[PDB]
Amino acid sequence: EQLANARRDYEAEIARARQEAAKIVAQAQERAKQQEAEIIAQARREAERLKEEAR
Amino acid sequence: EQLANARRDYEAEIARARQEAAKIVAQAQERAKQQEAEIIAQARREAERLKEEAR
Amino acid sequence: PSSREIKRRIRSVKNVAQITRAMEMVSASKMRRAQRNVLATRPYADRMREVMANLTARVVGAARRGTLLEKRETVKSVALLVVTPDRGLCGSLVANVLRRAGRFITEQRAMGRTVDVYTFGRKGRDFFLRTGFAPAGEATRLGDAPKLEAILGVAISAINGFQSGKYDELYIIYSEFINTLVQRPAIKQLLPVESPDISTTTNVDYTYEPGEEEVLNSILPRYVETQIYQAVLESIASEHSARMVAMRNATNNAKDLVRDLTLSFNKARQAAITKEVSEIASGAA
Amino acid sequence: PIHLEIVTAERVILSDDVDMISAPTKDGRVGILPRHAPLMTILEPGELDIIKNGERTPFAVSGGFMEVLPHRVTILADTVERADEIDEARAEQARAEAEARRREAQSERDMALAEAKLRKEMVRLRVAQL
Amino acid sequence: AEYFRDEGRDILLFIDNIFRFVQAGSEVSSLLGRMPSQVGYQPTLGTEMGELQERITSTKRGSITSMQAVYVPADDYTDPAPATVFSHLDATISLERSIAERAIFPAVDPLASTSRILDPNIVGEEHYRVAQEVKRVLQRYKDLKDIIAILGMEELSDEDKLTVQRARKIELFFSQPFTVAQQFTGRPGKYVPVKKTVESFARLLNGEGDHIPESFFYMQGDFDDVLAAYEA
Amino acid sequence: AEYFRDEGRDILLFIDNIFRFVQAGSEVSSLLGRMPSQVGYQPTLGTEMGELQERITSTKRGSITSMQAVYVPADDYTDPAPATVFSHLDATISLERSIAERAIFPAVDPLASTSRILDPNIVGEEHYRVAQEVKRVLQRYKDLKDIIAILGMEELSDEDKLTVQRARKIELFFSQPFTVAQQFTGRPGKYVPVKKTVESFARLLNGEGDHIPESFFYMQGDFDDVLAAYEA
Amino acid sequence: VAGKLKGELAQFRDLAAFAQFASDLDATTKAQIERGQRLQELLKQPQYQPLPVEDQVAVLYAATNNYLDDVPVPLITKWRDDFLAFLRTAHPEVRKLIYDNRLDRKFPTPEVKEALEAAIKEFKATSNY
DSSP: OOOHHHHHHHHHHHHHHHHHHHHHHHHHHHHHHHHHHHHHHHHHHHHHHHHHHOO | OHHHHHHHHHHHHHHHHHHHHHHHHHHHHHHHHHHHHHHHHHHHHHHHHHHHHOO | OOHHHHHHHHHHHHHHHHHHHHHHHHHHHHHHHHHHHHHHHHHHHHHHHHHHHHHHHHHOTTGGGTTTTTSSSSSSSEEEEEEEOOSSSSSSSHHHHHHHHHHHHHHHHHHHHHHEEEEEEEHHHHHHHTTTTOOOOEEOOOSSSOHHHHHHHHHHHHHHHHHHSOSSSSSEEEOOOSSSSSSOOEEESSOOOOOOOHHHHHTTEEEEEOOOHHHHHHHHHHHHHHHHHHHHHHHHHHHHHHHHHHHHHHHHHHHHHHHHHHHHHHHHHHHHHHHHHHHHHHHHH | OOEEEOOSSSSSEEEEEESSSEESSSSSSEEETTOOOOOEEEEEEEEEEEEETTTTEEEEEEEEEEOOOEEEEEEEEEEEOTTTTOTTTSSTHHHHTTTTIEEEEEEEHHHHHHHHHHHHHHHHHHHTTO | OOOHHTTTEEEEEEEEEEEEHHHHHHHHHHHHHHOOOOOTBBBTHHHHHHHHHHSSOOSSSEEEEEEEOOSSSTTTTSSSHHHHTTTTSSSEEEEEOHHHTTTOSOOOOOOSBTTTTOSSTTTTHHHHHHHHHHHTTTTTTTTTTHHHHHHHHSSSOOHHHHHHHOOOOOOOOOOOOOTTHHHHOOOOOOOOOOOHHHHHHHHHHTGGGSSOOOTTSEEEEEEHHHHHHHHO | HOOOOOOOEEEEEEEHHHHHHHHHHEEEEEEEEHBBBBBBBOTHEEEHHHHHSSOOOOOOSOEEEEEEEEOSSSTTTSSSSHHHHHHSSEOOOBBOOHHHHHHHOOOTTTTTTTEESHHHHOOOOHHHHHHHHHHHHHHHHHHHHHHHHHHGGGSOOOOHHHHHHHHHHHHHTOOOOSSTTTTHHHHHOOOOOOEEEHHHHHHHHHHHTTTSSSSTSSTTHHHHHHHHHHHH | OOOHHHHHHHHHHTGGGGGOOOOOOOHHHHHHOOOOOOHHHOOOOOOOOOHHHHHHHHHHHHHHTTSSSSSOGGGGGHHHHHHHHHHTTTEEEEEEEHHTTTTTOSSHHHHHHHHHHHHHHHHHOOOOO
């Protein structure tokens, strides 16, 4: 039972580490995506301002 | 003696599991930083391209 | 013959061919597993067979053998165990077996013996419930792999019969299995006379603990039950092989019919195109 | 060191060599040793015991027979059970027998084959214009 | 209809036997000396059908919704007239004799009745999900009915018997009391919104409808209306 | 090609999809206004097929031999276009997909492919005898393709088991390295003369090479190549 | 990656008449039928949801190799709809790694092979189906 518990605990610790890794990577991805969307929106607004300047 | 060395090996395995968890989390943090930087750089270059094509 | 109804016929016959092909595959698989079951059952029957040989080599006393091993002189009443596949499509086996039941029920009825019938299967249960020979015993819903427990419900009664005097013999009509393509029907006697060549038994001697009489009286019903079980398993294997052969023949016939219908459909298609272009050219001109 | 065979009308249970057989003969329990004299006995509902190198396996037998040659033992038992397993139920032997057997081994077979016959009969009515 | 559509009001137009329109054109062409096309049909088949089926559309002001009737010669959907009609169809409703003779007042067959709107992008994910949940227990058309015929359900099915119960309940529930028939059968007409229909069928498929017997869904507008009846 | 034929040379003419030539003729006839014949075919179908494929003859000076791909409309070998093509054909080669899925590049189906010249009075009695026996064992193998999938190779009787074993070896031996495929496969091409082919296949059938497995017959030349390889 | 997909789909089509009799069949035939059913359910796709080349390659690599065998057939589609999402969020680098060397002659190069194997194993361990 101690060998079985060692295997189970190793697998559980690795799985929890991978879950934390996935969570933090997902948070970074969503933050980067929202900041990218903000930058794109600002660029589009500046382009519309340039069009109004041309008009 | 088998029980003694099995307990010792379980302790060593759980220590190795914690070490691997730390390594995985550190690698995930590095990947998250790299991916955020890449996404932000891509967004900035795209914004510059939209401004240039708007001009 | 309108180039579209022929297409429906082709589709229907192709569906028939596909269903028949699937049934043929599964009948082949179930025939293989039934053959495996028969092979697994062989050692028990063989062992009890040389046990019969040895014991009958002894206790030859007619009074001692008055129990089951006895041969009723009058033979006024007889019984037939018929094992018939439960579902049809089997081919000619269901009929070949229910016919030999007749040849027997007659040749016997002709001996003045009152022939009665215990039937294993719904196909048999009916041929006789119709003929009027309500099966003295009917075992239906028989699976590819039944257990000896099943035949017991009927074999107990047939045996209690050869003991109640109600019968003077028990024959089983079952479907043998000669080749993966052949499945001749066959009859076996169920009276446990035994007594093979003294050479077969080798006269192995034992110290029968409960007694020679008790061992014989408790072993003969088990021997006839084992014979019935072996016959039923062989019948199941022959049923599956016959169904496989019948579905192979039906699939070949369906493929030939598909070819003929394809030729007819193509002729109708060419005729339809010719008629259409002819009437279009006539309308143009 | 005697060639024991627990055979059954369905299948063979064991065919190994055994130290001791604690057979439940009808008159009384009988032990068998590698050079036992020829014998033929009727069993009663009981728990036959197989002694194999000091290990006792309690095969419950609800009935059956036994032939003991000097060199081999054959048990023509009606039913042989191993309650010692206990988990046999949870084990596929019974657990699968409940689902992997009968449920799909038979019920599913009957359903599929009957459905095939039904589709055949319906389409053979539908083709009754050729 | 287009006069009223110009006012912004919604119009429902029933072109009964639109196929007889096509046939008419064919004759008009044959007597006009036009060169025949395909099986005697007019060369201007697609354009003639378009000039009629394109005025049936939803503009900003109003919409002319059309529910036509199509008669296929013999049973040939390959024929040019049914094919041309189907090229301009958005939904098919297959009324059946079997459903009608079972006292199910709306004889619409749950199967063989399609609509291109039935995708999650337009109706909604829940509407599509339930509409696929139903017509799936009937995808087999209760194919169990064939098995029941030669097995008697094998006495009962391991779980299929439930599916049969749900299928019968929903088939009964498809029926609805109509207001126009209110003075014939003496039963008030029930108007059921699409949201009520989707919610009712979804909740019935979850199993809330496993407590009421059949014939309690026989002519009732919503699942809630069935419940009121069970409580009373 | 007739210029080279007139110089005494022997020419191979490869016509891809002669049915497309037939279709072009039919379209030209329809455009010209000529009355249609049978299934949308030109009235001058036989005459047009005779203007072609009649200059493809073996004359005194030279010979033009033609291989013509033929597309069969639907799957009709009785359709007027493939019928008129077949009326002018001396040999048919039937490439088949399954024979090519297994890496037998010369994927000629021996049972389907036939030829008029395969008669004793032209190719010789020995050539005719071996070819028929090659097809006979292959035909027996095709009949047993069902049975092998039915019960396994075990049920097959002996000799029949040999014919299946021999038939697989011979159909593998139908493979042959090609000089034009030398660079792709890295294997030199082998030109096997007709007499060498006849001798090799007769010596395969009579019993020689039976001990050799199915391999060593794959992509080889004569029987001599199959043995030399087995020794090495 | 798609060669084994095509082969297994063809094998399933040859046995397509046998799906409703899968229980009473050979173990290899049942396995082929089950794999074909899984692949056919994988090919099922909603509307207006095109999958990029790297996502298709990842899903087909997971399918051709014995990784969806434990997943039941009705959930195979769902499995895909989850797995790619996992790769879209948890492991964005493996998708780029697949897309970068999609033109490599020996595409399952050890780096991408280990990356994809690890991603599939990590997804299967966390999820339950």
